[PDB]
Amino acid sequence: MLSPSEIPQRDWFPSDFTFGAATSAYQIEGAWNEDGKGESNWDHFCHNHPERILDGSNSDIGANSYHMYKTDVRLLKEMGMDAYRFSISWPRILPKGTKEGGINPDGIKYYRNLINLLLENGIEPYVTIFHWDVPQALEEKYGGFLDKSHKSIVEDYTYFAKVCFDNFGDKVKNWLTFNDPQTFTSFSYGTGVFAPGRCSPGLDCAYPTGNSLVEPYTAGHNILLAHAEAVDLYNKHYKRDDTRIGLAFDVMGRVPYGTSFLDKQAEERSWDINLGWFLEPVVRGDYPFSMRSLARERLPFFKDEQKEKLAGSYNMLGLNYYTSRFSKNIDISPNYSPVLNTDDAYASQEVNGPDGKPIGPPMGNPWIYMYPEGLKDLLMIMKNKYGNPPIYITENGIGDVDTKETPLPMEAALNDYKRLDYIQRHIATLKESIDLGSNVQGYFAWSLLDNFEWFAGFTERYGIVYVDRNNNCTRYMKESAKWLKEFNTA
């Protein structure tokens, strides 16, 4: 519903600016036990706990992109995308997760063929090493990223990254070590809505025998140690002058709930716990002060050698931006006690401001509210506080609800003008942000394809391309994809 002169055009942006789409391995690949692939944490969680997926489903098939990857590339090419963000399945490459367990050559051939095909079609691969799919072998051996020794997972992740660099590094110039460390740790070990489904006693998850105040910080610490080890390896033995490594953060914009200075403080604590938790370690080598003061002993300390490896451990940064929240102060008092790790921010995160209105229009699912102004706020924080590094918006989109009780007619799914409007408004925000001096360099639509949306199952469709599961995952371009084609190829 933007007027014609407000619709973004490709020539608003630099010639070397990048437009792409994004997927992740567990969400699209299927072929969960084919050609030597080992079980993952998510295979295990979905198979043993279908009650913890909203529609009882799994990603045994997904979008069948293991078998249908060629048509994925054709879609990207037809839309004139500059790049494709996808992830590598750790267990597909290393079925037992370790060096000892062996490299799976069919796993390697799959990603090799995908990468070469993208490149022969003029499409740049942006490769996520880890997008939440831990080999179940490692989960059973030492709990994966829960590894209390801060050694085994770091070595096993580092070797995995090495295998990717050896086998794909000659063709891949853009790596991201981790995707959404914050969501992964908080949801897997805090609320337990993600595999393996752990949380404190008294809380509603599959395994209420963890600790929602400690385990998320343990896993987060292991993620940062792993990231720093992998980047140290990459810089020393793999990086060339035109290649880049980083990681991608999930981030909601934060706006103070009211005019009180207390809500400004709340807002700052909220940026810190969401983004700062992982950003500040890679920028300066330690967690934010606020988190140290509030989580205290539950947040591990780094060795000085590890801080050195952490500080400056990126050439670029990914931001996965979807929505924003109002941050409202909570005082420290004997009547409040944190239950979840995210409660350490002493701030409630509200959809509705003091007027009772949502921060922006609802996009249809339980959590996405359209607030492009938050993207601008975030890019200005990256510019003015964190050194203005090269930024890619590695995910941005909405999920159309499609359930057994309230089906989404294919016709309505394809006429996705709500998604299109949302994409247009966020892209236009990026131009406004560039004009203000943001070092943002690209934008990736989250979801080339309708796919398995984690604990939501297939109840939400995020694709710019529809996937008919009743057929054989046949792909049809939605209106959003048709505009992106027009946009890129004018």
Site for its own copies, rule CB under 8 A = 261-262, 265, 284, 286, 289-290, 292-294, 301, 329, 331-334, 346, 385
Q: How far is the CB of 321 from ligand NTZ (least distance, A)?
A: 8
β-strand pairing of 317-329 with 244-256: parallel
Alpha-carbon separation of residue 17 from 137, 175, 244, 344, 391 (angstroms)? 41, 17, 15, 38, 11
Give dist(CA 22, CA 165) in Å, integer.
20
Question: Which of 344, 395, 402, 416 contacts ligand NTZ by CB under 6 A?
Answer: 395
Q: How far is the CB of 197 from its own copies (least distance, A)?
A: 32
The phi and psi torsions of 471 (rounded to 5 degrees) equal -90, -120
The residue among 391 and 456 lying less far from ligand NTZ, judged by its C-beta, is 456
Burial of 6 (0-12, 13-18, 19+ CB in 10 A): exposed
Query: Residue 306 binds what, of its own copies, ligand NTZ, none (CB under 5 to 8 Å, by partner type)?
Result: none
β-strand pairing of 174-179 with 124-130: parallel
Residue 87 binds to ligand NTZ (criterion: CB under 6 A): no
Residue 65 binds to ligand NTZ (criterion: CB under 6 A): no
The residue among 54 and 262 lying less far from ligand NTZ, judged by its C-beta, is 54
Please identify which residue in the block is written with the tokens 């045994």: 60
Q: How far is the CB of 284 from its own copies (least distance, A)?
A: 7
Alpha-carbon separation of residue 33 from 26, 29, 300 (angstroms)? 12, 11, 37
Q: How far is the CB of 301 from its own copies (least distance, A)?
A: 6
Question: Which of 313, 453, 458, 464 contacts ligand NTZ by CB under 6 A?
Answer: 453
Can you spell out the DSSP letters for 292-306? HHHHGGGSPPPPHHH
The residue among 249 and 302 lying less far from ligand NTZ, judged by its C-beta, is 249
> Pick from 410, 244, 384: which is nearest to 317 by CA?
244
Q: Alpha helices of 65-210 — where are they, by DSSP H?
A: 65-78, 90-93, 105-120, 136-142, 152-168, 181-189
β-strand pairing of 400-401 with 317-329: unpaired
**Which range, of 145-153, 225-233, 304-312, 447-455, touches ligand NTZ by CB under 6 A?**
447-455
The residue among 334 and 356 lying less far from its own copies, judged by its C-beta, is 334
Q: How far is the CB of 61 from ligand NTZ (least distance, A)?
A: 17
The residue among 65 and 290 lying less far from its own copies, judged by its C-beta, is 290
Alpha-carbon separation of residue 355 from 35, 262, 351, 369, 421 (angstroms)? 56, 18, 11, 16, 25
Q: How far is the CB of 306 from its own copies (least distance, A)?
A: 13
Q: How far is the CB of 279 from its own copies (least distance, A)?
A: 12
- Tell me, what DSSP letter sits at residue 458? T
Contact indicator for 110, 66 with CB cutoff of 8 Å: yes
Question: Which of 322, 346, 371, 422 contacts ligand NTZ by CB under 6 A?
Answer: 322
Q: How far is the CB of 362 from its own copies (least distance, A)?
A: 32
Residue 367 binds to ligand NTZ (criterion: CB under 6 A): yes
**Which range, of 67-75, 162-170, 261-269, 446-454, touches ligand NTZ by CB under 6 A?**
446-454
Give ∠ CA 27-485-86 in degrees, rounded to 5. 25
**Binding to ligand NTZ (CB under 6 A): which residues in 241-280?**
250
Residue span 156-195 as binding mask against ligand NTZ, x where in contact by CB under 6 A, dash where not: -----------------------xx--x------------
Rama region for 452: left / alpha / beta (φ>0; ψ in -120 to 50; rest): beta
Q: Give residues in contact with ligand NTZ (CB under 6 A).
A: 24, 27, 179-180, 183, 250, 320, 322, 367, 395, 446, 453-456, 462
